[PDB]
Amino acid sequence: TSQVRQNYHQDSEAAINRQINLELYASYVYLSMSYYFDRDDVALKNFAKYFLHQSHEEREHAEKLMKLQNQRGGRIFLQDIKKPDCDDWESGLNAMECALHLEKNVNQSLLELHKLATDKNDPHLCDFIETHYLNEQVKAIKELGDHVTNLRKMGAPESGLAEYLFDKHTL
Amino acid sequence: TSQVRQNYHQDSEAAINRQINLELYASYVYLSMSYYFDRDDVALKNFAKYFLHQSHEEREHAEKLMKLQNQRGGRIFLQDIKKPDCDDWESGLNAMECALHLEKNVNQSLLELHKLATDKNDPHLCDFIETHYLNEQVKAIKELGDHVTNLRKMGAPESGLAEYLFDKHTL
Amino acid sequence: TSQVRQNYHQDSEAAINRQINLELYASYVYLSMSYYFDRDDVALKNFAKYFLHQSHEEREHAEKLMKLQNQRGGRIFLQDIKKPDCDDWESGLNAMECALHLEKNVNQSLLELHKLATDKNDPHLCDFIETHYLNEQVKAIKELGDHVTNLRKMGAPESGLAEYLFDKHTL
Amino acid sequence: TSQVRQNYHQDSEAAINRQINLELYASYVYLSMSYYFDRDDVALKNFAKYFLHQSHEEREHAEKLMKLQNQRGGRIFLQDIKKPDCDDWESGLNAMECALHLEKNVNQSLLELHKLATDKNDPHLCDFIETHYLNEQVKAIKELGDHVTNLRKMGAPESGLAEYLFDKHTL
Amino acid sequence: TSQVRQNYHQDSEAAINRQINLELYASYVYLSMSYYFDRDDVALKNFAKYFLHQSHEEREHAEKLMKLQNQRGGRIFLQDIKKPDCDDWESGLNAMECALHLEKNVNQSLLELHKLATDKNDPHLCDFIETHYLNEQVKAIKELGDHVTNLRKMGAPESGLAEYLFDKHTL
Amino acid sequence: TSQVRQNYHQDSEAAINRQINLELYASYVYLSMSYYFDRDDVALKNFAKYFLHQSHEEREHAEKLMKLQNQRGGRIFLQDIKKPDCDDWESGLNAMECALHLEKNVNQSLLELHKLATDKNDPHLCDFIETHYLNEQVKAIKELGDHVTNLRKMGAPESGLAEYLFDKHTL
Ligand SMILES: [Fe+2]
Numbered sequence A, B, C, D, E, F: 001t002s003q004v005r006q007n008y009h010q011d012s013e014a015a016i017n018r019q020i021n022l023e024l025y026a027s028y029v030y031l032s033m034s035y036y037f038d039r040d041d042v043a044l045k046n047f048a049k050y051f052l053h054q055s056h057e058e059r060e061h062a063e064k065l066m067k068l069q070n071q072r073g074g075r076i077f078l079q080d081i082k083k084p085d086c087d088d089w090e091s092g093l094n095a096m097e098c099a100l101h102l103e104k105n106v107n108q109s110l111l112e113l114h115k116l117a118t119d120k121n122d123p124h125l126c127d128f129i130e131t132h133y134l135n136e137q138v139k140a141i142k143e144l145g146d147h148v149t150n151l152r153k154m155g156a157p158e159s160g161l162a163e164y165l166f167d168k169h170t171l
């Protein structure tokens, strides 16, 4: 080769292609969670709106990485998006615990993207990862921890009054 | 024949006359439910406002069917409106369960009105039933199911805090 | 039961339950009259709008009596609403004469409700009947008398120009 | 072939070409009626404005059918537009009776277009006919019936005061 | 089973689950096309904005079908989303031809969904398909046909002036 | 015749009846041209809007002549409107050339209407023709000549870029 490419390794190009697939898969998991809470035998509307907003954010993360790949001079290759591991999510506390578990994995993958970028002397890539992806994750993790603590203290999962009142007052 | 009548069978004319009576009877059942929740030993004001709104909607359904009957060239015949089957409604969950049971019967009657219109080659009547009466019913049924699920989970009927808080936050 | 009941007889409770049924029956009669004048071989739109307004007023009278019954500490019991005595109303002068005949009967029933209330020493009930129901009746009767006199003088019922011009200028 | 054609029969294509010609012919009949009522020995201005509005509506019906034909992938073929059957329309009641007679024929032709569409498994065409053409006809027929009834009752055609007052108050 | 389910077959439930997957796959194909036209050796910005808008529309179609599935009383099951068949799209006329080919397949699948709903006596489902999905498809097909015709006439693909001027003036 | 007729010959009455038919026929030719350019294998939207505007203007010319016939005291007689001579119009330059050829014929017919009015001593008719119909024609002819010259110079008909750019910039 490209006429705009300068100081961009092949390994970085492969790692960006893996992160794009990971973000699309997370967006699909959140979409499944959202429409579980819309059923007539679950019926909690603010849980549903919350997870639909999360699903709309992961997709913007993916599109931003695709724009970076085109700016630096590499080529995009897409893969299959696999289906989520759960079909029924069982409760409102259980979904929050699974969401925490997923955001920690995404954070762990970004940290290795950053160590690869520093092993190759690519300061533009290091600055991109630090500015756009690293503070957002620790904020999301802190919020999900707060939610899980409050739901455990109110008395869920073996109490429906707890999840009804949490649906009303926090979300 | 009448000078405006064209492609309108006698059987359709009798079935429309039966549906008008069914809508008037449903309006009278909702009016009974409403003023049960206004008594001084029940005293729940948002249950009462909710059922009064439902009562005002059924009467508009009936008047729309009468206008159709006059547009196509048939004649209206009215019958006696019978009294409701219950006098005391016992609880707030119990009334929602009876309301669900009533809306399902009205839906079942509309489906046979539609099969009769199809067996007779009357596309104007089929379009009227599909446009004005069929999506409204499935929406009403989905809402009443949501309400019953939430009230059962909060712990009603053997808990007064549940119905007090449901009166305040949902209705 | 009741904790709010004070100075309220059983006979008064039965008479209020009869007046509620009478008001619902009058509302049903006016609804029949209204949709007779909407047919394509009668076709007089302001007669129809006038009788539809009367039908919407009788129903509010009934709901106000139900609220009184709950305020004083009695219990509501509903009956069957019978069908009207006429199906075809024959003319525009004929319907006005039947309407006058019906309002006089309702007035006669209120006068006996008032004499019962005074025979029992119930001043709250006497004040309710005098304030909300007695001047409205004499005003409605005076108006229907005016209408009948004007229609007879213009030359109805054996003149269509008369009822066309009355539909247009007065109503 | 056409690159956009899918699930569209030749018979449907011929029937749409016949309906276009029928709508153009109806527009020409209404234009003749309009300018009859503008003569100095007839002189009724609101009859004339009413029939000119009807003439402007039939032409839009025809243009909408031509747009459908181009959307589905068929080809338009035009024919001769014949002249109306009457030159002098004789009265104001007589023109309304002829107008009713014409709208009933157009309705009868649309009903066979719909039965052809269902015999061929074309749901897009059935939905087009039901949504845009079938309720409009029954409304037009009900209105013309009202007009004819009122004019007969006022005493037309052997009374000029009747048609003068009807020209002034209804139209 | 469910407490809201009435007149809903198992076969319809399986067919809706297949249509959801088809809509998600179409959205992913459009997203691939969009970011091909953003490369530095292709560089056509209005082609890219056009295909990104199409990608955002398919996802709303899918979410609407999921809401229907929950309203009627069935259960959602998700599958893997496969990757697109092409990686490099070769030209601007070539992408429009592939887009036409895709929309025709989606239309063919909806027509069989409708024939299944008719063979089972489900008028609510038939009305849903006719109102929300069938006119939209024929409009999209007519537009893509227009685009392909204009690009072929201007002289593409063996002329860069053609696609530059089409990028500027139409899109 | 008539009580308002004065200085109006029978020959003038027949010539006005012929001009009305000529204007209706021109309106129908323009309507055919318009919907040829809407097909999916022609696809030029501003040619279509231009010819639809011309079609709406010819009909107003005809209605104005009918009003004059009623003002002077003659009687209107209508004939059959024949179908256009072409079905496929082949190109944009070709349609512009046919339009020029049609407007010249209409002008030639108006000039003989004027010579007839002068041979009969009818100054009101001469003033009508001069004020409302004669400058309009020479302006329309000058415009169509401009269009044909520009299209020939750009390189049509054997160049699609020419007609695409003329569609965009002039119309
Ligand atoms: Fe609270």
Ligand SMILES: [Fe+2]
Pocket (backbone or CB within 6 Å): none
């Ligand atoms: Fe240009």
